[PDB]
Design a protein around this ligand. Sequence first.
Ligand SMILES: [K+]
Ligand SMILES: [K+]
Ligand SMILES: [Mg+2]
Ligand SMILES: [Mg+2]
Ligand SMILES: [Mg+2]
Ligand SMILES: [Mg+2]
Ligand code: NA
Lengths: 52, 272, 89, 131, 46, 107, 27
Amino acid sequence: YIDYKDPEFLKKFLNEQGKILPRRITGTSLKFQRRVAQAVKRARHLALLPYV
Amino acid sequence: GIRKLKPTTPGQRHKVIGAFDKITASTPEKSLVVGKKKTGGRNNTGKMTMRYIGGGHKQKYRFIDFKRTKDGIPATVKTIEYDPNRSSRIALLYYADGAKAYIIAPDGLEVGHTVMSGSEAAPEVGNALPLANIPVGTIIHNIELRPGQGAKMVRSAGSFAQLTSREGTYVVIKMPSGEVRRILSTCKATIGSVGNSDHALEKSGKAGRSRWLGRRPHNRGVVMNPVDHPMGGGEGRQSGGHPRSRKGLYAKGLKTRAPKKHSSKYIIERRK
Amino acid sequence: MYLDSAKKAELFEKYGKSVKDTGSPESQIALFTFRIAHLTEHLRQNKKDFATERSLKMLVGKRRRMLDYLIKVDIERYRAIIKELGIRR
Amino acid sequence: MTDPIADYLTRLRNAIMAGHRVVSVPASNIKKEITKILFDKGYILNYKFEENDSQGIIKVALKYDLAHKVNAIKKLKRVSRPGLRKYVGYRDMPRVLNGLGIAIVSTPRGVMTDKEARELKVGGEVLCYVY
Amino acid sequence: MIVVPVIERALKRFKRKFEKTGAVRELRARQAFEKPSVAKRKKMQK
Amino acid sequence: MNNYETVFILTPVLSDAQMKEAVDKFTGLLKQEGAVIVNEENWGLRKLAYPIQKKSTGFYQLVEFQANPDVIAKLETNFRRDERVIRFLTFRQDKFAAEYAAKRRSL
Amino acid sequence: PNGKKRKRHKMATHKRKKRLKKNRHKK
RNA sequence: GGCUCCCAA
RNA sequence: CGGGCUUGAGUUCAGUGGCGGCAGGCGGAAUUCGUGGUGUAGCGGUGAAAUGCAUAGAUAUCACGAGGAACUCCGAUGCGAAGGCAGCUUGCCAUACUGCGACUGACACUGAAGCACGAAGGCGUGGGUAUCAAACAGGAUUAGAUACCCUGGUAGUCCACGCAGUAAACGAUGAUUACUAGGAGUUUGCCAAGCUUCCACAGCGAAAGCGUUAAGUAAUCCACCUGGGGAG
Ligand SMILES: [K+]
Ligand SMILES: [K+]
Ligand SMILES: [Mg+2]
Ligand SMILES: [Mg+2]
Ligand SMILES: [Mg+2]
Ligand SMILES: [Mg+2]
Ligand code: NA
């Protein structure tokens, strides 16, 4: 369970523009990638990471 | 709801009336009603100043509390009742003080509920609050224009207004007509929209129902003589020229609001 | 369907010998009827839940097939269960 | 399952086509009789009946001609299917491959081949053709 | 929102950052409408 | 019952007294609804990633509790009705998320 | 997958729909 | 007389 | 017809999973309109232009205000009977797969009628109406242009309720059951299921090709075909 908190942890999977990196760029597997994307979007909703 | 009549007669083929599904009592409160006299559109000199008025069913006036100055006294909703004087229904209230009053029935207000007025009242449906205390974006009705003068604005069946934003001593409200205008934040409004929104779906079906409601036949101007109407005259049918009234006032797009009225300073966007 | 293990156990104890007999025709018929009623209550509010519909119909079909098995095997048991559940309508 | 006898024939046929040496089938009385008839007529190398907790297993070891790498059985055909049952008398018993094959038939005297069915003058249900 | 704080080196860096972001590709894509069937079949063919 | 975690942001204009008043109002509403409370936190002032209501800083509060699934709607109605709050979110946490939260509270 | 087979059906559909659209509004 | 039904109350 | 069994089937328990359905809340980017500030000679568009908008103050830029619609990256996989399903979150449902040392004991498969669901477009009533855009109007290109290109623009596209019942509704391949080779990838809970994609033995096929997700080997039931046009 990746927490929507720890935004500093969350930037590990983001690029310079704040977008979500593809699963092929890193080593993630599908379940972990889905959890990462969900956490990133939850934190964006909570205004913990920028939308742009 | 509505009830569509079956076409057993030609006068009933196209008749749709209300289902009266919200009314819980049939008798009005005796201390809050009084017999009302009719005008045939005649003023105090006896001259007919307004046409097409006359007859109809006898009616009694119901005292509606449009002011709601009993701040902080809770009241219980007793009955939802028919009112012949307005398109909406009304609600009977029993205050814990022992008073009784009639209010415009909002959509969603049920018998057995509690209502309150004043600043400390919760913003629930049926409660009356100063606009300074209403959360932004709430559907409202029965809006005061001046503080203490009583609700004037949003009263017809099914109608509602919206509090769009607040700007200090004034709030911004969007009207049923689509006008956006500024209202003093010390004026009061009631939470919720007026009930009986199916009132617009009713069809009279026959001329007799208009006669019962107290309207008299309206005559077109093109079927009069020139001495009676500017649009009358001619051999056979004729179009009557530019549409206008008996006094020659144009009836297509000519504006009649006074161009120097002061209230236009509070009107942001206009729509009729 | 407000269905949980406690309610299922209560139903199995009420219908069929012992509480561990989850597979008896009577126990299955009782469970099907219970969740059929609850799904009807759900649908009357969510009238557009066409997926909960036809799930209701598949439950009805399962109950009908169990009742047909009871017909083929022991008619008296079928009379008793439909009397105790008020099914026929 | 709709036709266990046809399934048994299909298992044998598929094993032969694939080139297997042993085929395992779920057991039944009529299937055991058919396996016995096949062994007696010389179409299969061997068979074994195993009685486990289920209905049992028939283990059949097929016969291959080492001279030509050709199985002893060429065609297996189901005749009387559930959708169309076929019964014949002893006078109208079929002859398979002009007498070079066999027709397993169930008769009131038991399950046998068309040759002994004709000899004993009994008819019945034509189960299958083998050659 | 590509930011290149700072002239030829700065301009080359800005152009490279824009190319890496791919703003011109998405702009060319957004210049016209594509049916979902067209997009799905293009993805399947690619 | 069910484990929930809500995070909400208040405006940076109120003081600590109004902090305590508002958070205690929400806590008392949950308690009246019938919820037990597991852990209340306060991240204080944080610079928002993007401006909200023309404001770039906020006050972050987190509450993890247990309740029947009927009190969430009342909680959101109160949240909307209160003009002091600007952004709220709630999550129903499963077994894995509750285990992670317990580890976080233990650490 | 010649194409003429579908062209003939397309022609027939065009003719039928034209007939119906011409017959509409006339009683 | 009351009762029932109705809305135009 | 009567009795028995547990492998088929179903019920229970546990584990795991999902753009599966319905309903309520919340959000940011972009676009349109209005108001105000700066500023003035063009903007827009094409193969090239014109129509169009602009000194009675456009395009551009900053702020205030309002409203509608769609959800970048993740993102090619996954789910659903099919049609289809993708911002976040919650509530209420449904369901698949795996195992159980649990239960019942053949309770099964298919299915003419019938019923339910069923893309887009279309129809009725009431809301809403920003973008795009049939019809329509204008400007071009042409021998003409009732088109392709450009500028406008109304139904419609959005929501609720109700009709309608169609599609290249396609894997152009009906549903069950059992069996029969290899390679290369891939999702999920522990080598192994349950899937989801490409070469390819036997076999099948007129061939292209199919090939354990068969178009192979067999059994059960349903639908449909019998030269083309006329003619759905
Ligand atoms: K008239
Ligand atoms: K005159
Ligand atoms: Mg005359
Ligand atoms: Mg004339
Ligand atoms: Mg045509
Ligand atoms: Mg077809
Ligand atoms: Na419509």
